[PDB]
Amino acid sequence: MAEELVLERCDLELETNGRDHHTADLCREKLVVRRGQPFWLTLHFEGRNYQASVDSLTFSVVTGPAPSQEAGTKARFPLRDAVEEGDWTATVVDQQDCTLSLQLTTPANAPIGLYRLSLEASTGYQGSSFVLGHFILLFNAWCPADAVYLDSEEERQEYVLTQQGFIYQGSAKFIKNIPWNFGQFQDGILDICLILLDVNPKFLKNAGRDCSRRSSPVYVGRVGSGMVNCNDDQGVLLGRWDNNYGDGVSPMSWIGSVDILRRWKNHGCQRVKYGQCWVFAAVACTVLRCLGIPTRVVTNYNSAHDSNLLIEYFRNSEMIWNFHCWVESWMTRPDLQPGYEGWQALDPTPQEKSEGTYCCGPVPVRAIKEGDLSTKYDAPFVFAEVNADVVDWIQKSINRSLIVGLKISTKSVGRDEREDITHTYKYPEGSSEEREAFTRANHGMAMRIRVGQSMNMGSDFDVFAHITNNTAEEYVCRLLLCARTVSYNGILGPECGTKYLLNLTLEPFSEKSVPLCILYEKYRDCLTESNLIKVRALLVEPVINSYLLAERDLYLENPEIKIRILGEPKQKRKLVAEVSLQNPLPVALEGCTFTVEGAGLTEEQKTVEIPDPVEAGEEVKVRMDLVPLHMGLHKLVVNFESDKLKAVKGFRNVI
Amino acid sequence: PXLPF
């Protein structure tokens, strides 16, 4: 007898829902709500209203292209009074002549995204099923049961709802606060953000699983950040640091994330040119804030102090920059060991390189501080941005030419002020906690410059970076080994040999002597009458960001003047002195002249002239007459001068 | 812009 209900219309209650879900800017036309929290829909029936004793109403929701109940992307649930906490439910909260106001709740771990809501109404022996509408479901920092819950309203306002903020740039000494329009609730931005998820490589690999995993703010943070500068062509931005941004738009121009996002969408999800670290970070903040994950942009500063090999290596994309920016997002970490909930570092700057679909993060900030580098995801990459260990061997010594991890900064909550969060990444220098973390992060290595034989002006010779690994672990390092001439007063001249090794493998409990050949032809023209060559080595281990420097000055010695004493040493009479020198160069010597003197042996300075040039390796001798007189020691003294080999000295004691 | 430290 009872006939089926006829829905006239469903009122999405955008106004009360927007307000209560903190989604009002997003609900001007469509319904956007947050998980784990009741929202309202008001049904209007044509004719007869719902009667619980006759009518059975059942709701169905699906999200994604392959919804399933086991995946959590499909749910079916009846309209009824009993409300099971933590489930998809619908209950009556008001009933008037023609209207039925319902309260629907979603699980606090439901997948986020666009859902289609359908209703089946059944009266007795008949049923009818149809589409009520759609809603977008987001993460809920207000819901205690949600992984992204933040216990503080002022922080929820800052990190989810506030659409403008500050990105710090400049330097550690001169911090710049650049205002930024994140614009997460601007028209079209949420749709663009859902698009970004639906073109991510994990969605292409398995869209049903991808949409299911969108329950997790770990998963969505990883994908969201990871997609901003994505090795695949569908990422949001392309990086560039060569001051040459004419293809497109300069990183320094942008004052917001919105225009970039809209550009990206409009050009077939093709990367927008160009980003730099803070532009990637800024767009990541927009995306993640849109989806409901509390997020904040952070800047770390690094500082040099200036001939250093270390600063050369870098000067002339895991560099160490004047500043670097990433984001932090707030969430629990049930996928990790207990106690890692809270801020998680996400770094959307280009190179996904070691392993995995994305880099870098999320990694708990506490894991970084604690040097617990086995914690997923990509902990070494974030550790390396705020730590660098640099040691000199001039011969063991700490080198502060490079200080990384200074004045780590983010906008203060509810204020236009800078909050220093360095303490969150780094224990104080020299503290037991710092040293204990440094121990956990690297679980014996040494370097010095060796030669192994005499070094002679005119010769080609090898120098060696002698690297010792006295630990149980393998190391893969980059090595820079080079030589430059140097003056007695410490002025570095031109290069006379260089060797770069991208891939030096150091086996456990082993050593290597890595040679570099120093050629006469390379140091000859550019070398001081000091005869000095500075050899410098830099061993880099980019994973932990550790640096070993070795430096040694070498003296290229002059040829010896042989001085021979013909005749007797008796305290009296005639005596002849034979002095010689072998040309050590591979080239002939022009304008050779010996000058000789020595009171007690001679009374005239004897200067010999050698017109016949001394060929390479040829020795030249000259004999000259002495005449002693008294008991004891006399020192004959010799100068040899040339066009290519000046002021070489010698002496001999006689009697 | 971003420059080496």
Residue numbers in the entry:
A (entry chain A): 1 to 306, 309 to 318, 328 to 406, 414 to 461, 472 to 683
B (entry chain X): 2 to 6
Copied sentences from the primary study:
Human transglutaminase 2 (TG2), a member of a large family of enzymes that catalyze protein crosslinking, plays an important role in the extracellular matrix biology of many tissues and is implicated in the gluten-induced pathogenesis of celiac sprue. The catalytic mechanism, related to that of cysteine proteases, involves an active site thiol that reacts with a glutamine side chain of a protein or peptide substrate to form a thioester intermediate from which the acyl group is transferred to an amine substrate. In the absence of a suitable amine, water can act as an alternative nucleophile, leading to deamidation of the glutamine residue to glutamate. Its catalytic activity requires millimolar Ca2+ concentrations and is inhibited by guanine nucleotides. Human TG2 consists of four domains: an N-terminal β-sandwich (which, in contrast to previously solved TG2 structures, is fully resolved here) that binds to fibronectin; the catalytic domain containing a Cys-His-Asp catalytic triad; and two C-terminal β-barrels belonging to the fibronectin Type III CATH superfamily.
